Amino acid sequence: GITGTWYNQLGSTFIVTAGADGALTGTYESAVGNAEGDYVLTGRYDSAPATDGSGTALGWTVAWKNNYRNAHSATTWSGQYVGGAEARINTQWLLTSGTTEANAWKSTLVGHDTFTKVKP
Amino acid sequence: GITGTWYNQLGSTFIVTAGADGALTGTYESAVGNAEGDYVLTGRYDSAPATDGSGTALGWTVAWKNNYRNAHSATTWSGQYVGGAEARINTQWLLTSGTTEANAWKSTLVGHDTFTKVKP
Amino acid sequence: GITGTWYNQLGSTFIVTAGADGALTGTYESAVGNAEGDYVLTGRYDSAPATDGSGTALGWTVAWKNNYRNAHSATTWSGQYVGGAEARINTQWLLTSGTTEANAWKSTLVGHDTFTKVKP
Amino acid sequence: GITGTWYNQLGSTFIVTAGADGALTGTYESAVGNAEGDYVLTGRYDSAPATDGSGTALGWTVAWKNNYRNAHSATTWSGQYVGGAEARINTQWLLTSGTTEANAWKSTLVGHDTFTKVKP
């Protein structure tokens, strides 16, 4: 039940299709950072998860280049999907920027997002 | 630059194809963890990187399910490709396992990987 | 502001004393993991925070050894204290277990914690 | 064998004493960021680690305020010590800054450092 629209706490929006194979493909609209419009997203998910109640592991990447801006950065979300009345995708994320060698050490931001099927 | 076979510090291999559109595709074989054989890889990279000597932002995911195993988990690498005599893909990763709600707190491991174009 | 008893989202408690010098001292009791009883806590915080409405940078460590248990691991929380009607300590943490070299790759878990001044 | 001077790959220097109890106390000189001089560091370590070859879990915090600058930030290192000819402390780190609420999402940098008993 991953296919559809999801909203994080910060008002960001993404749409995705979860293929029967394990493909995640869709769009991400970010409500923060140097971003404007929709950005392509692609990732993977466990298409045959544990049947003991455990969530479904997944992950996806968005490169912050589109027709509007190019932040020269990229975020990957790593987390799991959990079904039910209060369905949510809980993730941790890493945002790496292209940096010179001198600045590499501070190239990566880390955060956490919680996505739900309704807006905050 | 990015397209080709890559090797990390631990014995893992990473064969990737960089699309003109910013797409990352390929297969991954992990030397560690609950894995064996090839796994699908999907990601994105900045197809118009800055020209100031900055690295090239990218990310990809691998879900650890293939025809032989399912670890009920996914790893995302977030990083930057760096050129030179010694080109590298410089990454940090998160590995999230599908868990129950009462084990969600210890769901995600974090680490780093350096990919070089020659075997360790 | 920071000195006092704090509670996270999972049932853990965090009693801390903020020194004038920037020192953080106290005891922690974890509701999760390989833990029971009180554990020593030591850390630091910015004793001269900016006045522009910014949070107050801080961090502390707890090694999971006390007179009753030893989990051969340590957790560091990195975060910022935020004032208001609803003061919070906003954190991300890394939990590193002592491992063998061939398990060093899966040594560290990453997560986040929100500490409030009232019980969950 | 933690007590003494350690150098990371980036030329940073720290000195520490590991008390028989589990106390880490000392100084950190950073070779990167908005830092000048020595900064106080405090943390914890496992003072009775596993006797199977496993490393010794530890963690420490530095608040980036001293007599020279105040970056209004703080780093926590989480990792393990490993003895032997090639002794090293391998860590992951989190650098949180005080931010307004609007900017909290990007308040934390993440990296990895490897410390040795001799300079790079």
C34 interfacial to chain D (CB closer than 8 Å): no
- Confirm or reject contact between D111 and chain A (CB < 8 A): yes
| Cβ pair B98, A47 in contact under 8 A | no
Query: Is some CB atom of chain B closer than 8 A to the CB atom of A2?
Result: no
Tokens read off for B100? 């129950």
Residue A14: name the closest of A56, A42, A47 by CA: A42
Q: Which domains does chain B have, with CATH numbers?
A: 1-120 (2.40.128.30)
| Long-range Cβ contacts of D22-30 (<8 Å, 24+ apart) | D22/C40, D22/C63, D22/C65, D22/D46, D22/D47, D23/C42, D24/C42, D24/D58, D24/D60, D28/D62, D30/D62, D30/D64
Cα separation, C119 vs C8, whole angstroms: 8
**Dihedral angle computed from the Cα positions of residues C26, C27, C33 and C36, in that order, rounded to the nearest 10 degrees:** 160
Answer whether B46 sits within 8 Å of A64, measured CB to CB: yes
Separation CA A113–CA C14 (nearest Å): 24
Q: What is the DSSP letter of A101?
A: G
Query: Do residues D23 and C42 make contact, with C-beta atoms less than 8 angstroms apart?
Result: yes
Q: Contact at 8 Å (CB) between C48 and D30?
A: no
Nearest to residue B14, comparing CAs of B22, B3, B23, A44?
A: B3
C80/D104 touch (CB, cutoff 8 Å), yes or no: yes
Which residues on chain C are in Cβ contact (under 8 Å) with A80? none
Per-residue burial over C77-94, b if 16 or more Cβ lie within 10 Å, else e, is bbbbbbeeeebbbbbbbb
Q: How far apart are CA B71 and CA B32, in angstroms?
A: 12
Resolution, expressed in angstroms to one decimal: 1.4
Give Cα separations from A103 to A45, A62, A99, D31 (angstroms): 33, 22, 6, 12
State the sign of the Cα–Cα–Cα–Cα dihedral A40, D99, C116, C26: positive
Closest CA to A4 of A118, A114, A82: A118
Nearest-neighbour CA in chain A from B18: distance (Å): 13
Q: Rounded to whole angstroms, what are the CA distances from C4 to C14, C27, C115?
A: 8, 11, 11
- Asked how this structure was determined, the answer is X-ray
Q: How far is CA B103 from CA A28, A92, C9, C15, C39, in A?
A: 29, 15, 14, 24, 22
Any idea of the CA torsion for C109, C115, C118, C119, to the nearest 10 degrees? 0
Question: Rounded distance, CA A102 to CA A38, Å?
Answer: 32
* Euclidean distance between CA atoms D63 and C90, whole angstroms: 16
User: What residues of chain D lie within 8 A of the CB of B112, using their CB?
Assistant: 92, 112
The Cα–Cα gap between D79 and B1 comes to: 34
Neighbours of B9 (CB within 10 A): 13
CA torsion sign, B85 to B86 to B90 to B95?
A: positive
Give the residue carrying structure tokens 């293929």.
A19
Q: Tell me: is residue B93 an annotated ligand-binding position.
A: yes
Helix and strand totals (H; E) in chain C: 0, 8
**Distance of alpha carbon A56 from alpha carbon A50, whole angstroms:** 8
**In terms of C-beta distances under 8 Å and separation of at least 24 residues, what long-range contacts does B34-38 make, across chains too?**
B34/B64, B34/B69, B34/B71, B34/B73, B35/B64, B35/B69, B35/B71, B36/B68, B36/B69, B37/B66, B37/B67, B37/B68, B37/B69, B38/B66
* Residue D78 in tokens: 């989480």
Residue written as token pair 């106080």: D40
Spatial distance between the Cα atoms of B15 and C55, rounded to a whole number of angstroms: 43
**How far is it, in rounded angstroms, from Cα D11 to Cα D25?**
20
Residue type, B41: L
CB-CB contact of A95 with A84 (8 Å): no
In three-state secondary structure terms, A29 is: strand
What does each C-alpha distance from A106 to A49, B7, D37, D71 come to in angstroms?
35, 24, 20, 15
Min Cα distance A72 → chain D (Å) is 16
Q: For residues A43 and A74, what is the distance between their CA atoms, to the nearest angstrom?
A: 13
Q: What CA–CA distance (Å, rounded) separates C79 from C91? A: 4
Interface membership of A107 toward B (CB under 8 Å): yes
Nearest-Cα distance to chain A for D49, in Å, is 30
CA–CA dist B29, B51 (Å, integer): 32
Q: Annotated binding residues of C for biotin, as ranges?
A: 28, 39, 77, 93, 105
CA distance B19 to B21: 5
Residues 6+ apart with CB under 8 A from D23: C42, D17, D42, D44
> Is the Cβ pair A75, B78 closer than 8 Å?
yes
A32-D75-D31-A76 Cα dihedral, nearest 10 degrees: -40
Q: How far apart, in whole angstroms, are the C-alpha atoms of residue A13 and residue B45?
A: 21
What single-letter DSSP state applies at residue C15?
E
Interior/surface letters B22-53, b for 16+ CB within 10 angstroms, e for the rest: bbbbbbbbbeeeebeebbbbbbbbbbebbeee
CB contact under 8 A, A106 and D95: yes
C109 in A contact zone (CB under 8 Å):
no
The torsion angle over the Cα atoms of residues D62, D66, D72 and D74, rounded to 10 degrees, is 0
**What whole-number distance in Å separates Cα of residue C73 and Cα of residue C35?**
11
Around Cβ A23, how many Cβ atoms within 10 Å? Answer: 17
| Tokens representing residue C47 in the block | 């004793």
Buried b (16+ CB within 10 A) or exposed e, D46-82: bbebbeeebbbbbbbbbbbbbeeebbbbbbbbbbbbb
Q: From CA C110, how far away is CA B111, in angstroms rounded?
A: 9
Residue of C nearest to D106 (CA): C79
Contact (CB, 8 A) for C97 and C118: no
Beta bridge partners of C16: C4, C26
A105 touches chain D (CB under 8 A): yes
- Is residue C100 within 8 angstroms of chain B, CB to CB? no
